[PDB]
């Protein structure tokens, strides 16, 4: 278990740990901080949730996404099958052996403290020296955002349906409840059109507006629903928004590289997200170590 | 510079006059840092005397 | 000494947070009596000295004062706003020091009120003495005096409320010991606030003049074991303020007082427990308990402040990287050199 | 380095001493950005302090 290349570890322990935490610290931290508009608020926001979740959140699910990841790779080589003549007589041994080292293990209480400060000071940093780093942290970002927009289109398609084109080709007919949600994301289309940066929450009348409207079509709709769909709406404007700024964004290097503070191109977010994939890559070597050194000793004793 | 007295010996005039963000914050700053300089003295004594 | 900082924080975090979100989270002694119930005694004897006005019946409190006891080399007190030191040893500064007392009392109250909700921090110093802040606070009157405002009583209550709504407060109730629990009100109000009793203490005062008046037993016992109230505290202990006169000097009562216990036959029957009684038992027990709710409670307020004062930091690197925070009178001063530079340009 | 890539340690172009090199190159980066961060936070405040 222990002849295998620190480049497989490394992969592994990275993708798990950032998808344990990716949905907490966007939702959380990111999407509360997004809704100001004012850059020094929107960072020290960031800055206080960050500190809060990594004093004592942050290692204990380090510690577990580690151990679940050696636990994998541990229990798969007990019961990988060896073709044709792999034996069944020590299989039940193995599991059994399995199970009780399992429940000793104990993993050490002081990489976790130890861990706490190594983080911290990672994140700390707040430049990026190299070009490559910020068109990766780019990168990292679609491939983030994408699979957030994802979720968000499967529920809005899942709230209406498919486009009429579409419902054409198919052959599929949308529900009444179906095109009264249709209608009502026709109505949040003007309302986010006309102001562009219109806020997260509501006001009630708003919904008497939205409503009147709907009336007018000759649909009855209750404000709860108007609200659950402005939420999705919102949510999928904002993610195509941070999409946008990507883009304008791709080219703002070399305005950072002179410090342009003063220029509207303040990609906060590229460099916190930066930030955050610098850490893992921290982390995961980190863990690597450890998994490869303190943890083996610990196995053979109980073992 | 008589002016510039006059408004040194009213700090009413001072406080109306100056309101703003960086203001607040140098202030509650230096007012959180004094009682957190005392909380640190309190106590390091009080653990010091056993 | 280390109550003197302790002191020092409360003040500066009252002037600092105007509402009780951060007051309310360390200890605190807080003190309810009635009309010539002998508050003023207790806390007297507490402190070794008779510092507080004194007379013929009337609540000369018309101002709650902060006393707090600290070491110090000499048995002095200070006021927090007034340099002047009065020495206690000496009887004629101590009547001084009551009529200062009493003017800054009157001088405190505001248009249309007799009581002033202000409260006057007063740090009593001494060699020996316990190290614990406590609060005085006007008497309870059951009929409103027709020289005090009509809403003197309202005020009174407002205030013991204001100090008991911090959790951590610690609860001194004095009543005297001539006057059955049924005829005092504030009794039942500190039962009915304090359903728990993890931090009540009651303090009963003419002990003797209760025993003199052939009490009965099974109710001081009762009292003194939390059987007769319902409520359920930490202990109950009962003290001797003279013979109520009110220039007895402490000295003797506190003699008069352990000779009447020592003499008592209900403590050498096994009735009441020995450490019951008397108030060094007590000042120790409370000290002790106050102390180390003190030190747990700090810790914490250390951390939360250091960690809100980092949270201010970052803010200010956020929005201001390249300049220096600077208070009121330094952007005064920088103002007018900007000033001056402009003339000259 | 392609050798290195498939763990040719039979092979006898043990590069040991590039290994170890790289290894302070890669100390002295880590520790010169952990000394400009403390640099840039952590003494400035005493200096201010002692000014």
């Known amino acids: ?303 | ?50 | 000494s280390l109550i003197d900082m302790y002191s020092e924080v409360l003040d500066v975090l009252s002037d600092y947070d105007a509402s009780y979100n951060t007051q309310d989270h360390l200890p605190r002694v807080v003190v309810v009596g009635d009309q010539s119930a002998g508050k003023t005694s207790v806390l007297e004897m507490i402190a070794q000295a008779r510092i507080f006005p004194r007379g013929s019946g009337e609540m000369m409190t018309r101002s709650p004062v902060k006393v707090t006891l600290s070491e110090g080399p000499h048995h002095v007190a200070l006021f927090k706003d007034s340099s002047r030191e009065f020495d206690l040893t000496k009887e004629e500064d101590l009547a001084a020091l009551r009529h200062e007392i009493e003017l800054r009392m009157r001088k405190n109250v505001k248009e249309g009120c007799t009581v002033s909700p202000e409260t006057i921090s007063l740090n009593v110093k001494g060699p020996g003495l316990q190290r614990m802040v406590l609060v005085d606070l006007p008497g309870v009157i059951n009929t409103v005096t027709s020289g005090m405002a009509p809403d003197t009583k309202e005020t009174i209550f407002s205030i013991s409320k204001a100090y008991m709504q911090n959790p951590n407060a610690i609860i001194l109730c004095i009543q005297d010991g001539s006057v059955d629990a049924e005829r005092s009100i504030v009794t039942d109000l500190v039962s009915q606030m304090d359903p728990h009793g993890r931090r009540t203490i009651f303090v009963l005062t003419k002990v003797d003049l209760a025993e003199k008046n052939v009490a009965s037993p099974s109710r001081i016992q009762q009292i003194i074991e939390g059987k007769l109230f319902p409520m359920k505290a930490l202990g109950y202990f009962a003290v001797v303020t003279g013979k109520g006169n009110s220039s007895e000097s402490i000295e003797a009562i506190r003699e008069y007082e352990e000779e009447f216990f020592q003499n008592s036959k209900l403590l050498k029957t096994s009735m009441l427990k020995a450490h019951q009684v008397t108030t060094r038992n007590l000042s120790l027990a409370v000290s002790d308990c106050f102390w180390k709710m003190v030190r747990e409670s700090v810790e914490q307020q250390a951390d939360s402040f250091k960690a809100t004062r980092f949270n201010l930091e970052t803010e200010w690197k956020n929005n201001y990287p390249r300049l220096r925070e600077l208070d009121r009178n330094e952007l005064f001063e920088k103002a007018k050199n900007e000033i001056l530079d402009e003339v000259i340009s």
């Open chain 2, 1 to 50: 510079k008589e002016v510039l007295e006059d408004f040194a010996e009213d700090g009413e005039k001072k406080i109306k006059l100056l309101t703003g963000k960086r203001v607040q914050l140098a202030e509650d700053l230096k007012k959180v840092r004094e009682i957190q300089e005392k909380l640190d003295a309190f106590i390091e004594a009080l653990h010091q005397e056993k």
């Open chain 1, 1 to 303: 278990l222990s002849q295998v290349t620190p480049k497989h570890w490394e992969e592994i322990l990275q993708q798990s740990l950032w998808e344990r935490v990716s949905t907490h610290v966007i939702e959380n931290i990111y999407l509360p901080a997004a809704q100001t508009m004012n850059s020094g608020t929107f960072n020290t926001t960031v800055d206080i949730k960050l500190k809060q979740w990594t004093d004592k959140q942050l290692p204990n699910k380090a510690v577990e996404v580690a151990w679940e990841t050696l636990q994998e790779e541990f229990s798969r080589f007990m019961t990988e099958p060896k073709g044709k003549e792999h034996d069944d007589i020590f299989d039940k041994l193995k599991e059994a052996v399995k199970e009780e080292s399992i429940k000793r293990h104990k993993w050490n209480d002081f990489a976790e403290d130890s861990l706490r400060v190594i983080q911290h000071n990672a994140l700390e940093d707040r430049s990026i020296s190299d070009k490559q780093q910020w068109d990766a942290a780019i990168y990292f970002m679609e491939e983030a955002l994408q699979a957030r927009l994802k979720d968000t289109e499967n529920a809005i398609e899942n709230m209406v349906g498919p486009d009429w084109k579409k419902r054409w080709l198919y052959w599929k007919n949308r529900t009444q409840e179906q095109c009264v949600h249709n209608e009502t994301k026709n109505e949040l289309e003007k309302m986010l059109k006309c102001n562009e940066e219109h806020p997260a929450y509501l006001a009630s009348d708003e919904i008497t507006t939205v409503r009147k409207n709907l009336e007018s079509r000759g649909v009855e709709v209750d404000p709860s629903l108007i609200k659950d769909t402005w939420h999705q709406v919102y949510r999928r404007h904002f993610l195509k928004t941070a999409l946008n700024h990507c883009n304008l964004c791709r080219r703002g290097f070399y305005y950072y590289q002179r410090h342009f503070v003063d220029s509207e191109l303040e990609c906060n977010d590229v460099v916190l997200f930066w930030r955050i994939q610098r850490m893992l890559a921290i982390t995961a070597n980190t863990l690597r170590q450890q998994l490869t050194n303190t943890e083996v000793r610990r196995l053979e004793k109980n073992v």
